[PDB]
Design a protein around this nucleic acid. Structure first.
Ligand SMILES: [Mg+2]
Ligand SMILES: [Mg+2]
Ligand SMILES: [Mg+2]
Ligand SMILES: [Mg+2]
Ligand SMILES: [Mg+2]
Ligand SMILES: [Mg+2]
Ligand SMILES: [Mg+2]
Ligand SMILES: [Mg+2]
Lengths: 205, 82, 152, 146, 123, 129
RNA sequence: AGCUAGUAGGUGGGGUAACGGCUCACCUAGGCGACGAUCCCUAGCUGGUCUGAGAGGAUGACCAGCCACACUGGAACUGAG
RNA sequence: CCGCAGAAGAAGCACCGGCUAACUCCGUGCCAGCAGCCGCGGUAAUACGGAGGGUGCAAGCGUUAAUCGGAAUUACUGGGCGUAAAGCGCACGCAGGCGGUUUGUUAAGUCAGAUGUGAAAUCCCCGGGCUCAACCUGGGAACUGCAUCUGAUACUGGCAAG
């Protein structure tokens, strides 16, 4: 059950650079976007504790498209594994196939990448998959089948892909719609817009 | 009587057979004596899925374990002694 | 940089002849992250004045700690009026587990990983004082070595 | 006697008279036995000579297993013309509020023994209001926590 | 506290009675209300409360509070009790599941429909 | 009455530390002098001397690195009311290796680290830190 | 808070596919019990499951081993069982 | 798996005064009514009923039923007994519990090494197959237990001497 509904209000509920819609139509602070000025605009009640942690969990979940139960399963797997629980959780979240497509550029938005993955616009190692929860291993290759080539869907996504920067672990060619995933990311390369140990504290509670 | 036979333990529509030495008075899923190995029907025939212990099979046959049709068929499928 | 944070604020009464004089009391802690933990109680007629006085009191009488890289070098037990605190080194563990009136003080002390539990009456002031006393009574391996003839 | 223990412990009754009231067959035939709930009947001003309010109907098993008989039904007090405007004026500028007290019987009519009681003042909440204000201040002052 | 005393008589745990003894570890019970009436409440919440005494299948008669505004309950009614006590009513520790073979939902109620039996309307 | 000499010795040591006494005297025994030796190996005290023949008296001198006492905590473990025995590797380490859990093993009296290095076990006399 | 006299044991017979009061005749008057005998209530047990950092607490859902049962009760035969 | 028209055929529940994530209006006016607690509701209810709007989970949401945890609130690890519950009114004493100092001897308690065993199943670790998962499965460890053979003699204890 992928989330569906308003997105600008969803983003302004927290107020961050979570991510935006792929199309842009006057995306700026025209009059009221996230910190609405004029006669009102109370943005933060400033809750004492566990509230910022809940907000971080919610923004993480809505960015990645994952539900609460699956996110908690991922957290439990990360805690069971070695290393740091937060980075292991972020590694699993990025290894989710939909985020791989989004960061490779074939998905204009993360929701669009999930839609494509469901509609079988993606293949891994020469095999179709219709699960946005698949975990990719290092040193792998993920291709796009010939049917998804003729999609203005994908053309716009690949056009918008090259306006951003590029990651440490993905190398994608659009002459064949194929991307090699070499290594796994880390907190250094990941955006520093959230805290992981607060989330760890919350579900360890 | 003591015999070597196959017991089913896999999930629905994906069976899994274990070859084992068990007295005939017990059931298929019932108790046994000594495990011998497994034979996967689907077998995922890129990797393994067929592992029998011919030494234990021979030792129990020497003591009186009656070979079953499926065990003999699996032996003929893999090899007499290889 | 001074890592200041209060814990709880409560109002008191005097029950004077003319009625009740509702004053306010605070509770604040201060630190940097490498020891130097201080606390302040603070009383006043208003909440902002009380918390300011608590912060000012916490600024002085600041006692340092002999912490390890991110924790204590040994388990410790602190005892006070009606509160008992147990601290365990808890290596790695991607953070602390401490609860109210105690997670604030160690996050102020800067120790990220520690197993902290409180047995007894959960009075914030008393548990904070017990934690401070336990940290003070804690000793470093270098100190105990120089005291006892290390030979390790 | 249906003394209305609430109106007995608070604001003793001062004035009353004898009159019946109008009702249908559903909410009747049990007041003949005596069962009723007439504790602190909130009788207010109605254009029809202050129609009976407040008191509900007895919970006796006369129900059609849907409702008792009438969760809210019109009940009419009885006065030719003596207390409509006078009752309005008394409630407005005197402090006397007429409430129903008892249910006496002429063996046929369930009489509304309405009593004109004085409006008694509330207990001094000047401690709990400050307690609530302190509670909301405590809830709001939790801002400086990260 | 002495180890010898503990050995000679082990330290035992204190039994704890269940708050709903008449249920006997069962989620709900069925009975018919022997009487349905209203009971005067305690000091602070003088609001009138509706109760019924119902004799269950286990041979015990218990009093159960009725929630909602307006009750579709009477005597000789096959009811369902779920458990739960009200601190405002003396000696009352049961609740009635409105909407079990002899009760309807709260009239003109559009919120908490699941908790008060009413199904979600089409419009 | 006198049900444990070791507990009495520990209590006298703790009382001397509390009162800032320089030397504490008591009756002596083989177990007492063994415990004194195992403590002096780690230097929790200055020195122990036993004098007299008819009435052997052991006197131990307390170390003082500063105003604070060198030994802060000392607790009897294997009391007559409850004996304590641990495995080869399951001996307790007080304060994660800061202090000694004195243990009498098959070879004799030693500390926790010595017992772990020798690969045996015994009874835990007392924790000292 | 006492129970038990086929009950404790021995001497021989019979009986059991085998030991044995399993049973018979005799003799010895012991045996068990404050570490709970005898009696009352409850209960299938175990591997395990849940909850727990741990010691612990609850329970025996699915599956496996064992026990007992087949309207209630008693009895025997066939059959190696 | 390949083709077929169109998003065309598929979202609800609970909560929104503090515990805990979420604020405004209308009406009733200790009444009707909510609730686990604190506690609300006596004309202005973010708490009641409705409406608007927000939050938490989502083909599942809430109530109830049972266990543990938080309860260190049966505490052996890990409580206390002068005034909160708790030193028998006092003394003698058996079974019982513990026991001053030294030597020798026994190996009982204790410690070490080795063996068999702790059914399989299940937890866990390394891998594999079902579109990943749920699920199944290979190997390994663990199942801290139990008994046996040989040593250790510091401690407790059996025996012999003081
Ligand atoms: Mg015989
Ligand atoms: Mg039974
Ligand atoms: Mg616990
Ligand atoms: Mg407990
Ligand atoms: Mg206590
Ligand atoms: Mg007393
Ligand atoms: Mg006395
Ligand atoms: Mg007395």
């Amino acid at each position: 059950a992928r989330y569906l509904g308003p997105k600008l209000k969803l983003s302004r509920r927290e107020g961050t650079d979570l991510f935006l819609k792929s199309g842009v139509r006057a995306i700026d602070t025209k009059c009221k976007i996230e910190q609405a000025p004029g006669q009102h605009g109370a943005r933060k009640p400033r809750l004492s504790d566990y509230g910022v942690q809940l907000r971080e969990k919610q923004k993480v979940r809505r960015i990645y498209g994952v539900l609460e139960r699956q996110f908690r399963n991922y957290y439990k797997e990360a805690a069971r594994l070695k290393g740091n629980t937060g980075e292991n959780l972020l590694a699993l979240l990025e290894g989710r196939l939909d985020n791989v497509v989004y960061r490779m550029g074939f998905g204009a938005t993360r929701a669009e990448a999930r839609q494509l993955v469901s509609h079988k616009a993606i293949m891994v190692n020469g095999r179709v998959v219709n699960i946005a929860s698949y975990q990719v291993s290092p040193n792998d290759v993920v291709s796009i089948r010939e049917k998804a080539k003729k999609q203005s869907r994908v053309k716009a996504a690949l056009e918008l892909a090259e306006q951003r920067e590029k990651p440490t672990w993905l190398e994608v060619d659009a002459g064949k719609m194929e991307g090699t995933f070499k290594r796994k990311p880390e907190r250094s390369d990941l955006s520093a817009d959230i805290n992981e140990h607060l989330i760890v504290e919350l579900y360890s509670k | 009587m003591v015999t070597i036979r196959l017991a089913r333990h896999g999930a629905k529509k994906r069976p899994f057979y274990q070859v084992v030495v068990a007295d005939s008075r017990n059931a298929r899923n019932g108790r046994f004596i000594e495990r011998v190995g497994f034979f996967n029907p689907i077998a995922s025939e890129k990797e393994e899925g067929t592992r029998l212990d011919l030494d234990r099979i021979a030792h129990w046959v020497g003591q009186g374990a009656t070979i079953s049709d499926r065990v003999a068929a699996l032996i003929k499928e893999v090899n007499k002694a290889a | 940089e001074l890592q200041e944070k209060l814990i709880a604020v409560n109002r008191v009464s005097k029950t004077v002849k003319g009625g009740r004089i509702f004053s306010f009391t605070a509770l604040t802690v201060v630190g940097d992250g490498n020891g130097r933990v201080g606390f302040g109680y603070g009383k006043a007629r208003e909440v902002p004045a009380a918390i300011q006085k608590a912060m000012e009191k916490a600024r002085r009488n600041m006692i340092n700690v002999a912490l390890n890289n991110g924790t204590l070098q040994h388990p410790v037990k602190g005892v006070h009026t009606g509160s008992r605190v147990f601290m365990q080194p808890a290596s790695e563990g991607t953070g602390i587990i401490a609860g109210g009136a105690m997670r604030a003080v160690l996050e102020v002390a800067g120790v990220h990983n520690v197993l902290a539990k409180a047995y007894g009456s959960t009075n914030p002031i008393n548990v904070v004082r017990a934690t401070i006393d336990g940290l003070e009574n804690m000793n470093s391996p270098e100190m105990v070595a120089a005291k006892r003839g290390k030979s390790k | 006697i249906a003394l209305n223990k609430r109106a007995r412990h608070e604001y003793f009754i001062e004035e009353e008279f004898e009159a019946g009231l109008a009702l249908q067959g559903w909410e009747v035939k049990s007041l003949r036995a005596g069962k009723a709930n007439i504790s602190d009947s909130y009788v207010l001003l109605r254009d029809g000579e202050a129609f009976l309010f407040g008191a509900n109907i007895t919970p006796m098993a006369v129900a059609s297993t849907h409702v008792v008989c009438d969760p809210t039904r019109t009940r009419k007090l009885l006065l030719n013309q003596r207390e409509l405007d006078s009752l309005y004026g008394r409630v407005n500028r005197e402090g006397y509020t007429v409430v129903a007290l008892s249910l006496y019987w002429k063996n046929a009519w369930c009489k509304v023994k309405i009593g004109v009681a004085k409006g008694k003042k509330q207990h001094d909440k000047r401690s709990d209001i400050k307690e609530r204000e302190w509670q909301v201040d405590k809830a709001r002052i939790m801002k400086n926590a990260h | 506290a002495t180890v010898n005393q503990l050995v000679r008589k082990p330290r035992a745990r204190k039994v704890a009675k269940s708050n709903v003894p008449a249920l006997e570890a069962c989620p709900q019970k069925r009975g018919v209300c022997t009487r349905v009436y209203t009971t005067t409440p305690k000091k602070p919440n003088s609001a009138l409360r509706k109760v019924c005494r119902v004799r269950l299948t286990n041979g015990f008669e218990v009093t159960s509070y009725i929630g909602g505004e307006g009750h579709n309950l009477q005597e000789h009614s096959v009811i369902l009790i779920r458990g739960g006590r009200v601190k405002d009513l003396p000696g009352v520790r049961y609740h009635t599941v409105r909407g079990a073979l002899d009760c309807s939902g709260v009239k003109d109620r559009k919120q908490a429909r699941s908790k008060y039996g009413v199904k979600r309307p089409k419009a | 009455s006198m049900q444990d000499p070791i507990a009495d010795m520990l209590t006298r040591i703790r009382n001397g530390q509390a009162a800032n006494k320089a030397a504490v005297t008591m009756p002596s025994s083989k177990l007492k002098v063994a415990i004194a030796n195992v403590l002096k190996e780690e230097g929790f005290i200055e020195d122990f001397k036993v004098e007299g023949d008819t009435k052997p008296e052991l006197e131990l001198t307390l170390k003082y690195f500063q105003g604070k006492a060198v030994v802060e905590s000392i607790q009897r473990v294997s009391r007559p009311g409850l004996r304590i025995y641990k495995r080869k590797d399951e001996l307790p380490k007080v304060m994660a290796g800061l202090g000694i859990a004195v243990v009498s093993t098959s070879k004799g009296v030693m500390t926790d680290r010595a017992a772990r290095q020798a690969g045996l076990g015994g009874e835990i006399i007392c924790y000292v830190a």
